[PDB]
């Protein structure tokens, strides 16, 4: 695409500059260009890809929630008819959001996942695939909603199976995956008990493994454990 | 209080 | 430099576009960027490098000759004093020309020549080195003039020695090298008899080898032979 | 008539 003429290393360098400038749309475009060079990504490069798109889609999701709330209020009894504008604009933001999700899913399918053989890369990409199907599920209201939900579930499940066999229970990718799959269960799959069980079990197994860690790894793992605890406190 | 997902 | 962020293949592509648009300064900058990627050049890429810089320096040399002629007339008896402007402007063009020659010589030294092992590449680069020292010699008037001339001579001589041992007498690089070394002898080294001998011998040895060639190779070789004949007709 | 060097 438009990044085909720029060196891979320059795209990476510019992605890091865009991050410092909080220019996440640019950061994502640079990282897409880097992926499209066709080489596998290092750990740092995978993190840059993930940060960039999570920030872009995070802004779109927050805007979609604002607009969806306004639209829902407009459809309550006693609300004045204001025309098609709220629906139209929510749909515009929704279509943009879906486009970003499709872009990320396309990078994962062509060809990040198939080339990823180490547990740390494969689990990371499968988690991403689950996340972007989950974001599609957040806005899905039609006949493919069940299939979108099952695509998220299937990607998360494969990531969980690999992470349990190949990673320690304190590994940050394993922990972040479990956090997100637990959110999937709670608010996408209508399975709050599964969400709570997964969070509590993940937390307890990580706690039992902290003794093996250096001080820096302990800080990394406990940070994510606190997110699991935050959700357990909210949900129980 | 919005639930946490894996975000910085 | 300024081309460090552009892909090697994009620089090559743009050099070809610049050639089509007769934008030889751009073409040279793109090819310099391609050389600085550090990989060896293919036959086509070496030709693009040579075409680009020969056109840039060719324009500078033609302008220098115009200005030098004006300056020489200004220093004849009976000519009005017009101030320092003609000398200043000739010097400005001369310094620019020297800068381009130094740029090409720098690419050859860092690191095209040392990496060139095949006769076709090594002879080509040594011919280039002789040419750009020859262009420096055309404008040299000071204490290093003898050393500049000997640098041209030495590069041409090494190219000739390799070309005689490794190339057929009809090879276009061998022929173009001999043409240029003959011009060096005639107008730089004050050796018109050596220039004439080299041209006539090169022509005659190529003529004896034409029978071995395809129609297309015959056209390539005879085109350069005609340049040797043009010089012999002018010089005899 | 300027002498020829290796030019297109
Ligand atoms: C702190 N942190 C973010 C909260 S889970 C992480 O260490 C992290 C980031 C991305 C992925 C995937 C997993 C873990
Ligand atoms: C037609 N032609 C230009 C007149 S010598 C050539 O084939 C050529 C070009 C560059 C070099 C070096 C040698 C030969
Ligand atoms: Cl709109
Ligand atoms: Cl000037
Ligand atoms: Mg490259
Ligand atoms: Mg392991
Ligand atoms: Mg219960
Ligand atoms: Mg040979
Ligand atoms: Mg004589």
How far, in Å, CA of C93 to CA of C59, rounded?
10
By Cβ distance, the residue of C58, C224, C234 closest to D3 is C234
Q: What's the CA gap between C71 and A13, in Å, rounded?
A: 51
The residue ranges of DSSP E strands in C49-101, in sequence order, are none
Q: Which ligand sits closest to the CA of C93?
A: 4
In whole angstroms, give the CA distance from residue A203 to residue C162.
Answer: 73
Packing angle of the helix pair A119-139, A43-74 (nearest 10 deg): 10
Domain that holds residue A155: 8-235
- Contact yes or no for D5 and C183 at CB 8 A: yes
Residue C165 lies in a domain: yes
- For the Cβ of A168 lying below 6 angstroms from any atom of ligand 1, the answer is no
Separation between Cα atoms, residue A81 and residue A67, nearest integer Å: 16
Contacting residues of D for C180, CB less than 8 Å apart = 5-6
Which amino acid residue places its CA nearest to atom 12 of ligand 1? A173
Give domain status of residue A163, yes or no. yes
Q: Is residue A20 assigned to a domain?
A: yes
The CB of A46 under 6 Å from ligand 1? The reply is no
Any chains having at least 3 CB pairs less than 8 A from chain B are A
CB nearest to D4's CB, from C58, C177, C179: C179
Residues 1-8 on D with a CB inside 8 Å of C are: 1, 3-8
Cβ–Cβ gap C6/A7 under 8 Å: yes
> Is there a domain that residue A3 lies in?
no
Q: How far is D3 from chain C (nearest CA, A)?
A: 6
Answer whether A touches B (≥3 Cβ pairs < 8 Å): yes
Cβ pair C127, C163 in contact under 8 A:
no
C118 assigned to some structural domain: yes
Angstrom distances, CA of residue C157 to CA of A45, A124, C144, C150, C151: 51, 61, 20, 10, 10
In angstroms, the CA C32 to CA C30 distance is 5
Task: Report the number of distinct structural domains present in chain C.
Answer: 1
Contacts of A34 in chain C (CB under 8 A): none
Flag whether C154 is in a domain.
yes
Q: Which of C108, C131, C172, C217 to mutate to test the pocket of ligand 2 (most atoms within 8 A of CB)?
A: C172
* Residue A1 CB contacts under 8 Å (≥ 6 apart), including other chains: A32, A33, A36
Could you tell me if residue C52 is inside a domain?
Answer: yes
Residues 6 or more apart whose CB falls under 8 angstroms from that of A2 comprise: A29, A33
Does residue C3 sit within a domain? Answer: no
Q: Experimentally, how was this structure solved?
A: X-ray
Structure-block tokens of residue C163 = 């070309």
Task: Decide if C214 touches A, using CB distance below 8 A.
Answer: no
Given resolution (angstroms): 1.4
Domain of residue A34, CATH code: 1.20.190.20
List own/partner pairs for A129-132 with CB under 8 A and 24 or more apart.
A129/A105, A129/A155, A130/A155, A130/A156, A130/A159, A130/A177, A130/A180, A130/A181, A130/A184, A131/A54, A131/A180, A131/B5, A132/A53, A132/A57, A132/A101, A132/A104, A132/A105, A132/A108
């Amino acid at each position: 695409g438009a990044m085909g003429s720029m060196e891979r290393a320059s795209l990476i360098q510019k992605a890091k500059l865009a991050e410092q400038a909080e220019r996440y749309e640019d950061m994502a475009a640079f990282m897409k260009g880097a992926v499209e060079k066709g080489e596998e990504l290092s750990n740092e490069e995978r993190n840059l890809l993930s940060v960039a798109y999570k920030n872009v889609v995070g802004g779109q999701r927050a805007a979609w929630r604002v607009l969806s709330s306004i639209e829902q209020k407009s459809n309550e009894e006693g609300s004045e008819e204001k025309g098609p504008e709220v629906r139209e604009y929510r749909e515009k933001v929704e279509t943009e959001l879906q486009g970003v999700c499709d872009t990320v899913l396309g990078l994962l399918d062509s060809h990040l996942i198939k080339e990823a053989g180490d547990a740390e890369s494969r689990v990371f990409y499968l988690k991403m695939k689950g996340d972007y199907y989950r974001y599609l599920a957040e806005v899905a209201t039609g006949d493919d909603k069940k299939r979108i939900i099952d695509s998220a579930r299937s990607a998360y499940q494969e990531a969980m199976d690999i992470s349990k066999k190949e990673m320690p229970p304190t590994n940050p990718i394993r922990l972040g995956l479990a956090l997100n799959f637990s959110v999937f269960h709670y608010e996408i799959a209508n399975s709050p008990e599964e969400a709570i069980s997964l969070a509590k079990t993940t937390f307890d197994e990580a706690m039992a493994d902290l003794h093996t860690l250096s001080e820096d790894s302990y800080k990394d793992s406990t940070l994510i454990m606190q997110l699991l605890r935050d959700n357990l406190t909210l949900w129980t | 209080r919005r639930r946490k997902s894996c975000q910085a």
